[PDB]
Curated annotation (Swiss-Prot), chain A:
Boundaries of the shown chain within the full protein: 2 to 50 of 150
Similarity-based family: Belongs to the eukaryotic ribosomal protein eL19 family.
Lineage of the organism: Archaea, Methanobacteriati, Methanobacteriota, Thermococci, Thermococcales
Gene Ontology MF, one: large ribosomal subunit rRNA binding
Function recorded in the entry: Binds to the 23S rRNA.
Protein name: Large ribosomal subunit protein eL19
Gene Ontology CC terms: cytosolic large ribosomal subunit
Organism annotation: Pyrococcus furiosus (strain ATCC 43587 / DSM 3638 / JCM 8422 / Vc1)
Designated gene of the protein: rpl19e
GO process annotations (BP): translation
Keywords per UniProt: Ribonucleoprotein, Ribosomal protein, RNA-binding, rRNA-binding
Subunit structure, as described in the record: Part of the 50S ribosomal subunit.
From Swiss-Prot, chain B:
Single biological process term from Gene Ontology: cytoplasmic translation
Identification of the protein by name: Large ribosomal subunit protein eL31
Taxonomy, superkingdom: Archaea
SUPFAM superfamilies associated with the record: Ribosomal protein L31e
Family of the protein in this entry: Belongs to the eukaryotic ribosomal protein eL31 family.
Native source organism of the sequence: Pyrococcus furiosus (strain ATCC 43587 / DSM 3638 / JCM 8422 / Vc1)
Keywords: Ribonucleoprotein, Ribosomal protein
CDD domains documented for this protein: Ribosomal_L31e
GO MF annotation list: structural constituent of ribosome
Ranges in coiled-coil conformation: none
A Gene Ontology term for the protein's cellular component: cytosolic large ribosomal subunit
From Swiss-Prot, chain C:
Subunit (UniProt): Part of the 50S ribosomal subunit.
Cellular component GO terms held in the UniProt record: cytosolic large ribosomal subunit
Similarity field: Belongs to the eukaryotic ribosomal protein eL37 family.
Protein name according to UniProt: Large ribosomal subunit protein eL37
Gene Ontology terms describing biological process: translation
PROSITE patterns for the chain: RIBOSOMAL_L37E (PS01077)
Record organism: Pyrococcus furiosus (strain ATCC 43587 / DSM 3638 / JCM 8422 / Vc1)
UniProtKB/Swiss-Prot annotation, chain D:
Annotated spans, Disordered: 342-364
Family in the record: Belongs to the universal ribosomal protein uL3 family.
Role description: One of the primary rRNA binding proteins, it binds directly near the 3'-end of the 23S rRNA, where it nucleates assembly of the 50S subunit.
Record GO terms (molecular function): rRNA binding; structural constituent of ribosome
Superkingdom field: Archaea
Protein name per its UniProtKB record: Large ribosomal subunit protein uL3
Name of the gene: rpl3
Keyword rRNA-binding attributed: yes
RNA sequence: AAUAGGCGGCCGUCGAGGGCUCGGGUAGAAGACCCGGUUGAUAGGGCGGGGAUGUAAGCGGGAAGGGUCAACCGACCCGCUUAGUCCGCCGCCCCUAAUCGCCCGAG
RNA sequence: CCGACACAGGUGCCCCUGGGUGAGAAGCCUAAGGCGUGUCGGGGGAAACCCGGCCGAGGGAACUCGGCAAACUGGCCCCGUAACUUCGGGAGAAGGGGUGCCUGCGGGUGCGUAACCCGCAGGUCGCAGUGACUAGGGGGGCCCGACUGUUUAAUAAAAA
RNA sequence: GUAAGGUCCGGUGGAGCCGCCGGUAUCGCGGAUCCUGCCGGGAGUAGCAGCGUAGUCGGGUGAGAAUCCCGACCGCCGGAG
RNA sequence: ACCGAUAGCGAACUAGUACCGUGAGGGAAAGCUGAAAAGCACCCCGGGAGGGGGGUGAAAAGAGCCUGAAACCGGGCGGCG
């Protein structure tokens, strides 16, 4: 469960570098469960990303 | 000795290892020395070092750890899995 | 020079490509003929009795 | 022709190996008529300097001169054994040895800690840290019988030498607790006289003042400071190779010719440097001080300890010696001294020289 | 030293003595060697001594001048200040760790 | 990708570059972007010796085939500048003085109290003011080839 | 049996083999820096440095974590990485 | 009266194949369980790979499979040490 796809898609969505993405260290299970761009957008709106 | 749920103040002499290691390994060597010193002086099987303490050690880069570090050691007992009882010492700044 | 550094300049157009007639990768692309069967240079096949490759093809040597 | 030069280093100190024991051994003793113990022991403390009116023959006689000195702390030794030597087939062989029975120890610096009374130390307890197997149920009567047997052997004449077995007392100066046990010869020409001299002081304390005389020459025996493994450049003083050498500069060039087809033992090589048994000759004993203090002119008394204490050493609290020049060994090393075995023909007078200044400034 | 030595002591016909482990260097490439181990000042810590640099931060005042010739800015200087910082040196104090444990061993 | 390789080479550095200092696409620091994969880790007064780097009292080439290597000088401004000469040069010849910070004025272009650049007076600190970084040592004879250029890819760059 | 070798005994093996006469032949190996295959000592040694010396703390996953993942700190490149 | 898997054609077999060279061209290694898969059901241990029991078979011949030589390596025994 490496969050490379999630980090890359979040960076692409937010229009920034991949090193500027912050992922909540307490919601790693939610981030790993998120597998689609819709789920990643939902996490971004929630504030995990 | 220190019993469970008790709190002590220690002064770790980090300068004891500056000249025995290369200048660019001094911060990790200081972290190792602090952990070993706390374990020996608290008779603790496990030591948990606070990220604040780690940042204080790494404040001036990998080459200049502080010569002396004042730390706060709290001793707790877990007794997990039945393998006797384990003593865990938590290290915080000041 | 003349060695390992020289071998790094093999990223240009290949000298030989696949031949439409004989099926081997021997077609001189720049000149326009096959170095194996002579396609593009002769109507007849390029066979030489000092060569054993065409015999090897059919196990006739 | 070729170019000649003396060889690098001396072959008279080979093998250059680590000393057999940290406690020095004495192989030869001076010949004297006075009945006294031929030497003493102490611990190296540090170095300082004085200004003194020279009394030795030479150009600078009668002029005030600078003089470096070394301070050796010498707490009194404990005389606790007597050994007898007979003449064997190939040399001296020990015939018997008698030690005194256990006695209470009163110079031990006992300290009251929280709970428990004074430890109340006794002998055979500090000595156990060195011998580890001491007599059990040993009594004064049995000691007297053993001494009488030794004396009877002396009267019969089977004994050709007698020596005193002494032990250091580092606990007096708080340096350590494990003592050093050494054997010392006694001057004179009568075995009976030497035996009486040892017997009258068996079980007692001997001070450097009762043994040595101020202003006399001594031989100093110790183990030099260790340097670890050192290359030939430092070990034998060879010349560095040419600066264009691409295989190194701190090494010997040729380690031998074609023939003999072996490396000769005389070729310098790297190895152990320092920590060697060495003897220094003709070191003058400038002065003897008592209780860490030195008197100058019957009204001035100074503390030999410099301000801030000796570097890597504590404070001198017992009797001490002032030796002109430097002595081998490190700080806190055990040093043995004996009367000079080959003194010069024109020796300096046997008395303390006129001292005008003693340095007690900080040495760190 | 193959004539492979002498002596004192302790042990055996459970057991003297020793090793690993522990705190440190008079020592050190690994081994080895040396001091200490509650029969305690070995290291840390606290206090004091001695030393090395050179007078800390903060505040008050002055400062060539400017500024509505006011408020205010200002390199730098003076006082608190032989200060501050630091010590691979020493002394005193058992507050902390030198604990627990394991192994070999002649008969 | 090619070189037998997750090869410090070559192909491709082929096209593009925020802020400060600075003449600068220089060096140094830093934003964005990227990385901790130019991928075996741990210990140590734990040596000798080797490779890379810093310093060294007095002397200053006495070393050596040979000043090899290293060292001196170094940016900018102002004075000053030889033999010889193909009159163009030599030439940055050589040699000498200055350089920081603060306070305040003057000048050029400019509508401007916008921006850039050039001077003046005073105060003051340190051993040292191009304080790090960047950054020539110089001169006099002789041989050869006029010069810029080319060469033995892999021991000769030269008077060829 | 001088010998080149022959034959028996005990064990493994599971399907072919031998004495004598007369013929026949790719008919006998220790070497050719011989050829092919397999295996030793070197050796649990060298190498895993040099031109960019980079990791630490807390948490997670997992039988198993210096090396995988998240956060913080500390670093490198930044007219090129 | 040829050879019997280093022999016989280079190829007894997915052989002019894999693979080497820009290119003409060059070119290997590799056969065998058992009569019958009857190719090991079930139990204990291990994260797994596997190990130990227990079964099939006249015989494990156990698929890493007919016989299993020599070199080499580990252990046991006899002798020296
Ligand atoms: Zn063709």
């Amino acid at each position: 469960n490496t969050l490379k796809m999630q980090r890359r898609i979040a960076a692409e969505i937010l229009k920034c570098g991949e090193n500027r993405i912050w992922i909540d260290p307490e919601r790693i299970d939610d981030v790993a469960s998120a597998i689609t761009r819709e789920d990643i957008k939902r996490l971004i709106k929630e504030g995990v990303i | 000795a220190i019993k469970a749920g008790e709190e002590v103040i220690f002064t770790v002499p980090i300068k004891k290892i500056k000249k025995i290691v290369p200048r660019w390994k001094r911060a990790p060597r200081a972290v190792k020395f602090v952990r070993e010193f706390v374990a020996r002086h608290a008779k603790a099987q496990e030591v948990i070092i606070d990220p604040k303490v780690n940042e204080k050690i790494w404040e001036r880069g990998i080459e200049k750890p502080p010569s002396k570090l004042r730390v706060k050691v709290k001793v707790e007992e877990e007794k997990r899995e039945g393998e006797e009882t384990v003593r865990i010492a938590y290290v915080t700044l000041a | 020079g003349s060695g390992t550094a020289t071998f790094g300049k093999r990223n240009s157009t290949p000298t030989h490509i696949r031949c439409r007639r004989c099926g081997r990768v021997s077609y001189n692309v720049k000149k326009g003929y096959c170095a194996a069967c002579g396609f593009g240079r002769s109507r007849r096949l390029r066979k030489y009795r000092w060569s054993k490759k065409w015999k090897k093809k059919k196990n006739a040597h | 022709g070729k170019v000649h030069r003396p060889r690098r280093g001396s072959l008279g100190f080979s093998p250059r190996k680590r000393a057999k024991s940290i406690v020095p051994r004495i192989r030869s003793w001076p010949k004297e008529t006075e009945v006294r113990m031929l030497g003493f022991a102490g611990y190296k403390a540090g170095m300082t300097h004085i200004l003194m009116i020279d009394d030795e023959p030479g150009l600078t006689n009668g002029k005030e001169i600078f003089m470096p000195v070394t301070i050796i702390e010498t707490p009194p030794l404990r005389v606790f054994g007597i050994r007898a030597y007979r003449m064997g087939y190939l040399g001296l062989e020990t015939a018997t040895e008698v030690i005194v029975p256990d006695f209470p120890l009163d110079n031990y610096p006992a300290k009251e800690r929280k709970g428990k009374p004074k430890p109340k130390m006794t002998f055979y307890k500090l000595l156990e840290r060195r011998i580890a197997t001491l007599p059990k149920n040993y009594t004064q009567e049995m000691f007297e019988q053993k001494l009488g047997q030794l004396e009877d052997m002396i009267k019969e004449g089977e004994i050709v030498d007698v020596r005193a077995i002494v032990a250091t007392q580092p606990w007096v100066i708080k340096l350590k607790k494990k003592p050093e046990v050494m054997e010392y010869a006694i001057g004179g020409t009568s075995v009976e006289e030497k035996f009486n001299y040892i017997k009258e002081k068996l079980g007692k304390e001997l001070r450097v003042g009762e043994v040595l005389k101020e202003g006399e020459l001594l031989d100093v025996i110790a183990v030099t400071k260790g340097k670890g493994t050192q290359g030939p450049v430092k070990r034998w003083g060879i010349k560095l190779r040419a600066h264009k050498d691409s295989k190194g500069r701190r090494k010997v060039g040729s380690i031998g010719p074609w023939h003999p087809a072996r490396v000769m033992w005389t070729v310098p090589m790297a190895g152990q440097m320092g920590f060697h048994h060495r003897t220094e000759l003709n070191k003058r004993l400038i002065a003897i001080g008592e209780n860490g203090k030195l008197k100058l002119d019957e009204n001035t008394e100074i503390e030999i300890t410099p301000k801030g204490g000796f570097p890597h050493y504590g404070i001198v609290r017992s009797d001490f010696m002032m030796i002109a020049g430097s002595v081998p060994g490190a700080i806190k090393r055990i040093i043995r001294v004996r009367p000079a075995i080959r003194p010069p023909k024109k020796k300096p007078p046997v008395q303390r020289p006129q001292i005008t200044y003693v340095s007690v400034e900080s040495k760190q």
